[PDB]
Amino acid sequence: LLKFDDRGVITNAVDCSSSFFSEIQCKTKSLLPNTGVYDLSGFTVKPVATVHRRI
Amino acid sequence: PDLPDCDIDKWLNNFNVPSPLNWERKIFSNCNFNLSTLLRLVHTDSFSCNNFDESKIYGSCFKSIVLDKFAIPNSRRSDLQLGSSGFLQSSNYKIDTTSSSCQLYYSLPAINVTINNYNPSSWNRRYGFNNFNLSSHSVVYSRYCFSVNNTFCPCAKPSFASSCKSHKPPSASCPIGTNYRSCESTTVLDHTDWCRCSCLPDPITAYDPRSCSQKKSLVGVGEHCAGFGVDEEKCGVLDGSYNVSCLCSTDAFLGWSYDTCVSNNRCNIFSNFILNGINSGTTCSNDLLQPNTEVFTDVCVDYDLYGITGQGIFKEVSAVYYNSWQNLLYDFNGNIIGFKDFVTNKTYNIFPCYAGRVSAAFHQNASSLALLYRNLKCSYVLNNISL
Amino acid sequence: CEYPHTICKSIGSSRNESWHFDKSEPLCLFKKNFTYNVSTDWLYFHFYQERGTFY
Amino acid sequence: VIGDFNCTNFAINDLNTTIPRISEYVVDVSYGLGTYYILDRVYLNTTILFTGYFPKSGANFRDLSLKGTTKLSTLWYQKPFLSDFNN
Ligand SMILES: CC(=O)N[C@H]1[C@H]([C@H](O)[C@H](O)COC(C)=O)O[C@@](O[C@H](CO)[C@@H](O)[C@@H]2O[C@@](O)(C(=O)O)C[C@H](O)[C@H]2NC(C)=O)(C(=O)O)C[C@@H]1O
Ligand SMILES: *[C@@H]1O[C@H](CO)[C@@H](O[C@@H]2O[C@H](CO)[C@@H](O)[C@H](O)[C@H]2NC(C)=O)[C@H](O)[C@H]1NC(C)=O
Ligand SMILES: *[C@@H]1O[C@H](CO)[C@@H](O[C@@H]2O[C@H](CO)[C@@H](O)[C@H](O)[C@H]2NC(C)=O)[C@H](O)[C@H]1NC(C)=O
Ligand SMILES: *[C@@H]1O[C@H](CO)[C@@H](O[C@@H]2O[C@H](CO)[C@@H](O)[C@H](O)[C@H]2NC(C)=O)[C@H](O)[C@H]1NC(C)=O
Ligand SMILES: *[C@@H]1O[C@H](CO)[C@@H](O)[C@H](O)[C@H]1NC(C)=O
Ligand SMILES: *[C@@H]1O[C@H](CO)[C@@H](O)[C@H](O)[C@H]1NC(C)=O
Ligand SMILES: *[C@@H]1O[C@H](CO)[C@@H](O)[C@H](O)[C@H]1NC(C)=O
Ligand SMILES: *[C@@H]1O[C@H](CO)[C@@H](O)[C@H](O)[C@H]1NC(C)=O
Ligand SMILES: *[C@@H]1O[C@H](CO)[C@@H](O)[C@H](O)[C@H]1NC(C)=O
Ligand SMILES: *[C@@H]1O[C@H](CO)[C@@H](O)[C@H](O)[C@H]1NC(C)=O
Ligand SMILES: *[C@@H]1O[C@H](CO)[C@@H](O)[C@H](O)[C@H]1NC(C)=O
Q1: A–B contact (≥3 CB pairs within 8 Å)?
Q2: 3-class DSSP assignment, residue B350
Q3: Reduced to 3 DSSP states, what percent helix, strand and coil does chain B have, rounded to the nearest 5?
Q4: Which stretches within B154-271 are classed as H helix?
Q5: Which of B91, B191, B243, C50 could form a disulfide with B145 if both were Cys (CB 3.0 to 4.6 A apart)?
Q6: What is the C-alpha separation between B228 and B203, in angstroms, rounded?
Q7: Which residue of C has its CA nearest to B28?
């Protein structure tokens, strides 16, 4: 979530994946999002890999 | 976005023109150039090519650009054609014929011309050669070029120098890795001590060219002159005093002459366009049609700059706060709203032009139509549709 | 070369600038020289590839 | 092992002197570090997303300081300084 000034200079950027705070920050395109509940769609679950199916 | 140019026009129009003996070598790689602007800027007179045509340059891309540049003498103009057995093609510069090349004949004004004369040889300059003391605007051109081995010094041993009472040959001590002469006495009672050496009286006309230390070497492509002919007996330390090394005077060398390029207050300079890698490469001409014309407002002129295609009306709005590399500006959604030219440092705001509809009311008992243009002015409709 | 290395312009160097066998001119896709402000303190780089296009 | 041609054959050893120094400063993109300007697109007073390539924060810098003083070892090649440049 890159923020540009009046002269087009980057000052603050949101990671969107460092923690849940970055997700809520870049979910509404604002450095300070409004109050309320935020259902984080895309939460990390860290699953396992499954391959080579056997008959 | 555009790429930096090769700056060929800045090199061809250089005031420091070189002599035909030492042509300037310049290679252009990974850049762009315009043939039309180059030909319009230079004062060209003729354009010829070998196994190629100027019409095939448009579309085909070459691997690299190789150019040649040297002054053209006034008396040596009729022998510049390919295949001519003149003095220039025999000892000054060789023109390749088995590869695709182009010949450019352009002229430069006589004023602001600085000549540069320097022999591109090792043994010629190392064996006592000072600066080329010539007149202004003097085009020097060699006639006969000779080559020597890497183990031959143009001098002999001091033991035989003192053995001749009259017409003794000068000698000194050349560095290690060199061979002396083979002087011998042939007294036939004509003088007190008549002794002669090899390559006499001159290397061009010798009775035994096999025993001569230097032979006539023809010039080749991409190789300058091997050196002028010098007599072994005409140079060296007299009486073998052992003062300096085997150094020879500049006046001992022969086989060159000079001319001038003063013709209608202008000088001609030859240009060889050596091109390689037909229809394959990176650097080549880009004379195609590009959207770089005289832009103007009051009409939605088509814009195709910076890889973005759209239709819109340009508007002159001052914008100096842009960065040194910034060329455009986008909106919140991500669509183009303007740009900035990189050749005139001008900024424009793109406004979409009229593409709306028109309302027409019709009645069953009527014949005409009540056309109504929503959100428009009568002047715009009259100046953009019809009368 | 199997053992590449580069030299410095200040004082001397251990070896010479010879880490290849470029006896002629090769073919490059981008060959030019750009000068940067040497008086600065930091320098950030970025090199990522997408669809076979270098950056 | 990186090269495919032989140039030098003297003053070559195999002494273990490599040091995989890891930095103690993590990636901080809150002040524009790591963020790269778009190749041609430019935005003014806009906070728009960009699914580009940025370094992951919370990851310490891996220092690669390699030099040579009249001698060089083949040990620095491959593991551990030369890593697989994935993307
Ligand atoms: C990553 C690391 O540990 N770097 C060392 C560096 C290398 O171990 C070494 O130079 C590479 O050569 C091999 C493979 O042995 O060595 C440094 O110390 C040198 C140890 O030899 C040091 O004594 C230097 O020795 C010289 O003889 C030389 O030129 O090799 C003289 C030189 O003045 C001296 N360098 C000094 C005092 O700075 C090194 O080169 O600095 C130590 C690094 O940390
Ligand atoms: C090159 O970099 C140096 C240092 O990064 C710049 O010098 C600084 O200029 C500002 C402007 O007034 C001063 O406040 C600093 O004190 C200067 N620092 C130093 C170390 O001199 C310099 O301006 C840069 N030049 C360009 C052309 O960008
Ligand atoms: C070369 O020396 C380095 C430096 O000691 C060795 O790296 C160490 O390896 C041990 C074993 O895994 C670790 O416990 C240390 O933490 C490592 N130290 C550092 C600074 O990385 C390395 O193993 C040596 N290599 C060989 C082949 O002997
Ligand atoms: C940059 O964007 C901000 C965000 O919209 C603009 O701030 C708004 O400005 C208008 C007019 O001055 C106000 O009515 C809004 O209340 C402002 N929004 C907020 C959140 O304060 C700002 O004007 C823009 N700057 C430029 C130069 O376009
Ligand atoms: C040739 O001139 C046109 C005219 O603006 C320009 O767009 C183009 O980039 C030029 N090509 C070059 C310099 O290679
Ligand atoms: C070229 O010649 C003109 C007229 O003699 C002179 O005014 C001008 O300064 C010269 N330019 C250069 C670069 O020598
Ligand atoms: C345009 O702006 C750049 C940026 O400072 C400047 O270097 C250049 O001289 C200006 N003029 C032209 C014709 O490019
Ligand atoms: C149209 O003209 C006919 C002609 O007789 C008339 O009868 C009818 O009423 C008219 N209708 C309207 C809507 O004017
Ligand atoms: C590099 O090569 C030159 C020419 O052979 C030599 O004079 C010089 O000493 C060399 N330098 C090193 C560091 O080997
Ligand atoms: C940079 O490249 C140009 C090519 O036009 C060359 O003439 C110049 O010598 C180069 N300068 C350096 C410092 O490499
Ligand atoms: C260098 O490599 C070539 C090709 O592998 C080989 O023919 C040659 O013998 C090698 N020379 C040395 C000194 O290792």
Answers
A1: yes
A2: strand
A3: 10, 25, 65
A4: 158-161
A5: B91
A6: 10
A7: C31
